[PDB]
Structure formats: C-alpha cells, structure tokens
Amino acid sequence: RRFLCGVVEGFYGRPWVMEQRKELFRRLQKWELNTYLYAPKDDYKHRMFWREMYSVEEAEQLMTLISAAREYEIEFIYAISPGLDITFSNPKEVSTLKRKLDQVSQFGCRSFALLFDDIDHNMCAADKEVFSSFAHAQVSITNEIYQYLGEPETFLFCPTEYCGTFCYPNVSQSPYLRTVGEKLLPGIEVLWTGPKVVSKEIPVESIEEVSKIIKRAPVIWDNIHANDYDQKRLFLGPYKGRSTELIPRLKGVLTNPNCEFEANYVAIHTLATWYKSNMNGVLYSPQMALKLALTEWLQEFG
C-alpha cells in the first residue's frame, strides 16, 4: 500500500539550507518515513516568479539536493504555485509552466505538486470566458500538466479551499470541491489541512465528509507544528489530535513544521511513531510518543 508520510517545507521565513535538508533525509530514512515536499515560500521561482528559470548555480544545488533524496530513499516532490498572476486561458502561460517542470525533470525529479493555496478567488476577463468557474480553470491546467508529464505516480494538487473553514457554504455543499472531485483525474492526489488551517483535531467523520466530495482520500498537509504565524512560540509537543483510524482513510500525511529546523525532532519522530503504530488498515499515545522521541533526541545533545 502507498501512503506518503513525511515532511513539507512550506513555511514563510528563512528556508532550510542544503546540509539541513540532507540531515532531514537521514532522519526520515531512519524513522521509516518516505516523502519530502519542496514548497519553501522564500523560493521566488516556486511561487511569486514561477515563470523564471533556475540559474546554473541554482540548478546544481537542486540536483545535489535531489541526489541526496534518492541516496536516503526519500521521495522528492517539487511543488509549484502559479495562481498569483497566471492567465489560465493564454497558452504561452501553460507553455512556460511546462518549460519550468521540464527543467525540474532535468534535475532528477519525477513527482510534482501544483499548489493553488492562498490565491485570489476572482479570475481575469481572459480566463473568465474560457472557464465555467475558478475550479474549472485550476482543474484544466492541473489535468493538462499531469498528462503532459506522462501521468506520474505522485502528483499532488492543493485546492484554494484546502480546509473546512475556507469552504463556501460548507465542505459537503461546496460547489468548488464538487467540481474538483468530479473533473480532476483519479491519478492526482488532493491536499487537506483539515477542519482548519492549524487543525487542533482532525476527526474521522470530517475526513469521510471531504473524501465523498473530492471522490478520493486526501493527503494531509499538517500545520500542527507550523510556527511561521507566531515565531514567538515553539512547538516541541507530540503529533496529537489525529486518530490512527485516519491512516486507512488517507493517502498520506506531510507535516509543515517549525521554521527552526533543529526544533522539529519530536514533531517528525512522533509522526513516524503515529504512522508505524497503524501502518496497515488505542495504538498511539501522544504522551508516550513524546517520551520515546525525547529519549532518542537526548543523544544528539552530546
């Protein structure tokens, strides 16, 4: 069974450096985790300036980074966020998108993700004509790139309505998700942050609710340990509020942790413990997982 469990670097702030990312891979390997989602918000070329191309300096780095992902048996996913200034209709746009992903495929990356997180809900007049609803514009360009890349095994999609609070009128009645669930190809996976952006709890019932509308089990983008929104608070708590009952009902869990890389041990270690506790569809105690992780972490301090 294919469950994507790992870390997402998708925070606002100073991004992680080569050797940190390398260390993260060593860790994820040792803890039997398997994925890594490359979405650092600093990266202009992943978000703001998506149309732009990586330099030779940049190219060599990403190659070296992807080479370490393979080296440590970690799946590397390259995310791209174009929904800021993209003209969905115009084919030069769609052409440049393909050119970028081509360059990324040259680096040794096969798995991708198209993020439409935190972007303006209203379309420009050019796109407005061509597409029925904002969802139709996103789903069109997604399916296009997915098939263009030879329908890859790992292809994620981040909806604009990526959590429960953001749903208009609510999850079950959202015509946006209804559109995606009906029109997005089944080979593509959908990202979900749960009832909220930083969900305290992710109830099983809530995951059945959203699964029915997206017509698939989602991949959880988990913001539980995220601290970009309050860099005056650190989270050394155990992964908590997610039932092991969720595992057979999900395609994966990618944790968006604290900005401070070293402060993420307990988050990832406890995610691994949570995952391994019910790998196959009370098994997990946050309090116990914490002691487990701190006992292991203690060695690093010497």
């Binding site: 702030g13 100073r14 600093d42 703001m48 300036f49 800021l84 200034d85 993209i86 003209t87 115009n90 379309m123 420009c124 007049a125 050019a126 796109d127 970009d228 929104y229 309050d230 860099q231 005056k232 608070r233 650190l234």
Partner: protein, 120 residues
C-alpha cells in the same frame, strides 16, 4: 484584460522611520510608537471625535502592515530574515489591535508571555 504580472512596491524611508520607532531603544519608545500606544490607551478608556481619532489609528495600524509587506517583498532577504520574527510579530499584534478598534466602533506569545501578564 488578462491577469497582470507580479510587481511589488519597494521599501520606503517612511517605513524605516516607522520600523525604528516601533523597535527603538531599551528605555524609550519611538515617537510614532509611544503615540499609537497612547491612542489605543485613549480609545479603550472611551465607550459610546472618538471615531475621528479611531479612523486615524486604523490608518496608523494599516501603515505598520503596509510596512511589513514591503519589507517582506524586498530584494534583500538577508536583512529581512534577521528581523522577520520581530517585524512579523508587531504586524500580527497590530492587525488584531486594529480589528478590536473596529469592534469598539460597531455596537499567543506563548507560556512565558502568560507568566509575564500574571505579574504587575
């Protein structure tokens, strides 16, 4: 007719002058900061001219937020990354302080901060 390309407003001198007033000295607040603080203290001590000053305080808050944005979009990530925590933090406290004012004219910080509050 199409979607316009991404452009960002540059950091201005008026922003740096505001930034330095918010993060001034150990024993002194900057004029702009000491002021905003007095105005919020004043609007809270009142419940019903008030709306005349409140509209100005909401613009002042807006300036701190505008300032954060331009600072975050700026070319020099190195300067910003060294102050992101402080800058991001004041923008967040202002946003909610502003919101609180709009609520008055219509009728976080962790554990250390909680112990901080529990003292005179």
């Amino acid at each position: 007719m199409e979607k316009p390309l991404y452009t960002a407003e540059p950091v201005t001198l008026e922003d740096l002058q505001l930034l330095a007033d918010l993060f001034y000295l150990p024993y002194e607040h900057g004029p702009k900061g000491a002021q905003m603080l007095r105005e919020f203290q004043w609007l809270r001590a009142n419940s019903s001219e008030w709306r005349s000053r409140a509209a100005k305080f909401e613009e002042m808050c807006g300036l701190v937020m505008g300032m954060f944005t331009r600072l975050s979009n700026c070319a020099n990530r190195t300067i910003l990354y060294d102050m992101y925590s402080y800058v991001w933090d004041i923008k967040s406290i202002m946003s909610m302080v502003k919101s609180f004012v709009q609520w008055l004219g219509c009728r976080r910080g962790g554990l250390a901060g909680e112990f901080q509050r529990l003292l005179p």
